[PDB]
Every structure is written in structure tokens, then in C-alpha cells.
Structure 1
Amino acid sequence: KNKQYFKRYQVKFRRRREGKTDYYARKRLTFQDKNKYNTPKYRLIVRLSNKDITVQIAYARIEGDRVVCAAYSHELPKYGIQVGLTNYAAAYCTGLLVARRVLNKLGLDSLYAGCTEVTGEEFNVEPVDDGPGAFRCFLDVGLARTTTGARVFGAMKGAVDGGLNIPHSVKRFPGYSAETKSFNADVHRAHIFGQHVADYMRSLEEEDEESFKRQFSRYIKLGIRADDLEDIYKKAHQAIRNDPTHKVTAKKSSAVTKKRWNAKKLTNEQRKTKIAAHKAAYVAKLQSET
């Protein structure tokens, strides 16, 4: 069926086809008050893959969206994190990364030091006086569900503990028991230091050798026992507090026209002659029988 059904059809746009935005959150995310004219709203972007979790800082303009700051879990190999790139422990240091990377951009490395000794502290940073108004930040959850315990809040957690400025509430944290808080504030000390994962190595330390052949694999390949995980984080965090390397790369370059590579599109001379290569075959298949 459905011949003319294509004619009156129209679409939802491009990112709805590939499932990238929603257009319902982002519009009422970036609904800037018009009294302020083009002061940017400066939201924070966190997206995730099966192997990587990402952290971006961007804002809208008229033509589009400039993304001033970026992050990956790919940088964490420089900070002693080899595996486990989709942990809530790993979620902390990623938000911690850009939390001082912007402070190198605007020079606010001294002020807004943030929560230093993290053991699960609900520390909204205070707006300081007599000088720099603090750079506010807003949170997007993208397309994932903002249930109590999503890992996207862990990217917020290192961001809010690094000195960034968010209207931030606490009811959607993992470990805060929804019936009823009772803020067990030390549960993030088990989250950020990976103890919620580190017990699962220890609670499978003696039960199955095949458990290590299963998930939390490659920890055995590097001798990562279930004891020393938090200090890898703590040494990374001060090194995060030392300096983010700001992704300097100077290969420069092996990129251009390699090799062609994507099938340049067969213009009018090679279209109709390909038809002419195909038209003369069909009369030849009839000229064969007579």
C-alpha cells in the first residue's frame, strides 16, 4: 500500500530520527528570559556510551551552540584510571575534570576551590563577595531518566564539588533511601571511592574464578586487587586539582583525502551510460534467442 502516503508525509526533524534530542526539554531548558538579551544560559551536557561517559559545557547562540568545555573518560588514563570507565566513582572525577578546567580559562583557579575532602558532602558552594560573581551552571539529563540513582548525577557530583555553581538538590542521589531520608551522606564515600563496585570484586573474590573471567575482567590482567581503588581516585583528584592538560595534540596531520574514500557520486555521464550498459544487454538477451 501507501503510494501517495509519502506525499503528505513530513518528518520530525533529524535528531528525532536518529534519536538525539527531544525538543521538549531543550527548548524549556534553553528558554532564556528575553529581558537579558544574549547573556548565555551555559548549560552542562553529560552523555554516555557503553564504554565512555562524556561531559560538555555549552551554550546556545543564534546560529547554533558553541561548546566551550569538553571531557571524556579517555583522558583518565593520564590520571591512573585504566579500566572501569563507567563507574559512579569514574563519574566523579569526570565532573571534577572540567570543574577546574573552566577555572583555568577564566583564571578562577584560586577562588572557588570547592569541596576538597569528599566523603559524600552536600556542599552547595557559596556565592563569594567583593569580586568575581561565580559562573553558574545548569544541568541537562539528555534523554536518560532522572530516577534516584542515575549515574549522570555523579558527573554533577564532581562538578559541584570542584567549585561549580548549580541550583542543586539532593533527593535524586544513589543511596539516599527514598523511603525515607535519613541522609546517609557516607554512601557517596562508598560511591565516589568505588566501594560499591569494590565490594563486588571482594564479594566475588573467593566464589568464582570465572567471575573475574566475566565482568570486572582485565583487573586480573593488571593485578588490580579489591583493596587499593580509592587511593587511585584520591591521587587522581589532587592531580585533577593540579591541572587538566587541556588536550594538546600536535600530530598535524595524516587526514586529508584518505584514500578517496566514500564513493564520489557517479554523475550524469556515468549514470546514463551505466543505463546504456544495461539497456543493450536486455535486447541482447532477446537477440540471443533469435
Structure 2
Amino acid sequence: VKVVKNKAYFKRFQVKYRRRREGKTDYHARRQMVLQDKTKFGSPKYRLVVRITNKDIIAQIVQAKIVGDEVVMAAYAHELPAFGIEHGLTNYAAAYATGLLLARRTLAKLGIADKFQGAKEADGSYSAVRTKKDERFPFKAILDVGLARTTTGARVFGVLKGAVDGGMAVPHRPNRFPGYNKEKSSLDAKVHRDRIFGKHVADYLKQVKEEASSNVQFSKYMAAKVLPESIEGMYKKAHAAIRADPSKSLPK
């Protein structure tokens, strides 16, 4: 049995890109995302990058440059305690809140905060975004999800809806939202609203308490004595808190 990785194997070997070897970036998709019309002589174009870790969610607005990407503005789901959310980070409701927080900070920085108020009312409805590609036009960015799989109900789309309701232009169809039915080809705003406000979390929490009454899941809720029938209200209050103080961050 001759060895494979012999002397002649290394001389003819070409290494892949650094981030391809680390398995972080899909360069084929990145090229199509950063590409722009050459007749638009380098006018600004923006990505909404969403990355979900094990214990946090990350969302930033990025413009690409030769020297390296620059971040216009970033928001993290881990600072939502400063607005009134705890014990329930990295879920669909926190995704919605993260998106809305990012949009509010971005419009506030770019100075168009009063215009494009977004949707002060919360609903899992669909409304096609207004774009020149089709009155002052709304600030626009395209969604970047990375290597994540784009299945119906995934949290990347909840993050997206957060910004859309915050008042951003992100082109999209409502085909990957939780309430969508593929065979009938329609969306259920009631179901989407339920997932936005976190009814399923409350149902699971009630079930686990009722079952564990006899003789590790949801341990922090059970320990801190969080009660059902308040989760929707807590999220609804957090939304107003953000729209009042978009920058109130974690202390010190």
C-alpha cells in the first residue's frame, strides 16, 4: 500500500480560499450578491447579514469594499434585556425584535427616522416592498443568510420581517413564512402573528410544567417563576420600548 500524500502530492496541490477551508463563506453566492450593473458606476449597495449562533443572533448592514467590508450598523439579540426581554433569547420572537431594532437604529442614523415609520401595528401580513426596479423611495438592502437552509418558518425570515416592519425595503415573497400554505398558495396572518408573539412558547411551557408536576427543559423559566399568559404582552411592550429608545443598550 503506497502512501497517498507523498512528495509529489504536495507539489501539485492548490489550497482553497481561507474562509472556504474554514467552511464559513459560499463564494459562489457571494459573487452574485456583490455583483452590480457596470453602468451604475459603483453606487452603494447593501446587504443585511443574518447569522444565528447557538446562544445569540446577529444582524448587520454591510457594504463591500476591496480593502474589506464595512459595517454601517449592527444589532444583537443579546442586548434585548435592556428593553425588557429575558430568558427567551434566540427564538422567533427575539428574531423579529432583533430585525426591528436594527431597522430603527439604521433609519435613525441615516436621518430618515420620521419618514418611513414602518408598521406601528404588528401583523403577519404581506405587503410588497416599493422599489425603483419595478414619493421618496425607502432605504433598501438585500438579505444574506449564508449557508443556512431556507426552509419554511426558519428564523432568518423572522429577522427579515422584523426589519420590513421596522421600515426597510427588502425584496421578498411571502413563500417561506410560518403561515404560508404551499398547496393553496396563500398565507395565514393569524398563524404568523401567533409565531411572532410566541404563543407556541407559552403552550410548550404550560405542557412541561403540567407534566413535570408528577414526581431540565425550560429550567430558567421554571426557576425564575415566569408565568404563561404574559409572553405576548411582554413582547408587545418591548416593541414600544425599542421604538421609543432605539439606542438604549446594555449598561456600562
1:229 matched to 2:219? The reply is no
Q: TM-score, normalised by structure 1?
A: 0.79
| Cα 1:247/1:40, change in 2 over 3 Å | farther
- State whether structure 2 residue 237 is matched by structure 1 residue 219: no
Cα RMSD for the two superposed structures: 2.1
1:239 shift after superposition: 1.1
- Offset from partner CA, 1:125-153 (integer Å, 9 cap, x none): 55691xx4321110111110112121100
Aligned residues: 246
Cα contact 1:112–1:163 (8 A) shared by 2: yes
Give the conservation status (yes or no) of the 8 Å contact 1:134–1:165.
yes
Counterparts of 1:98-117 in structure 2, within 5 Å, are: 98-117=102-121
* 2:143 is the counterpart of 1:139: yes
**Where does the alignment leave 5 or more consecutive residues of structure 2 unmatched?**
none
| 1:155 equivalent in structure 2 | 159
- Structure 2 residue corresponding to 1:122, chosen from 123, 126, 144: 126
Instruction: Tell me how far apart the structure 2 counterparts of residues 185 and 122 of structure 1 sit (CA, whole Å).
Output: 8
2:206 alignment counterpart: 202
CA-CA distance at 1:162 after TM superposition: 0.5
- Residue 249 to residue 26, structure 1, CA distance change in 2 (3 Å): farther
What is the Cα deviation at residue 203 of structure 1? 2.6
Q: Assess if the C-alpha contact under 8 Å between 1:101 and 1:246 holds in 2.
A: no
Q: Deviations over 1:216-269 (max 9, x none)?
A: 22011221112100111111101111122275887xxxxxxxxxxxxxxxxxxx
Determine the structure 1 residue equivalent to 2:188.
184
State the alpha-carbon separation in 1 of the partners of residues 30 and 179 from structure 2: 29
One-letter amino acid of the structure 2 residue matched with residue 238 of structure 1: A
Q: CA 1:92–1:122 in 2, change beyond 3 Å: closer, same or farther?
A: same
Give the structure 2 partner of residue 282 of structure 1: none
Residue 94 of structure 1 contacts residue 155 of structure 1 at CA under 8 Å; is this kept in 2?
yes
Offset, 1:72: 0.9
Query: Greater Rg, structure 1 or structure 2?
Result: 1
Q: Which of these residues, 44, 49, 54, is aligned with residue 45 of structure 1?
A: 49
1:3 aligns with 2:37: no
What is the TM-score normalised by the length of structure 2?
A: 0.91
From 12, 16, 22, the counterpart of 2:20: 16
- Check 1:46–1:6 CA distance in 2 against 1; reply closer, same or farther (3 A cut): same
Selected match of 2:241 from 228, 239, 242: 239
Partner of residue 77 from structure 2, selected from 50, 73, 78: 73
Structure 1 stretches of at least 4 aligned residues deviating more than 6 Å after TM superposition:
none
Identity of aligned residues (%): 55
Which structure 1 segments of 5+ residues have no match? 251-290
Contact 2:116 2:167 in 1 (8 A): yes
> Which residue in the other structure is 2:177 paired with?
173
CA distance 1:46–1:195, shift in 2 (3 Å): same
Q: Give the residue type in structure 2 aligned to 1:219.
A: Y
Matched residue type, 2:152: T
Structure 1 counterpart of 2:61? 57
Larger displacement relative to structure 2 (194-203 or 172-181): 172-181
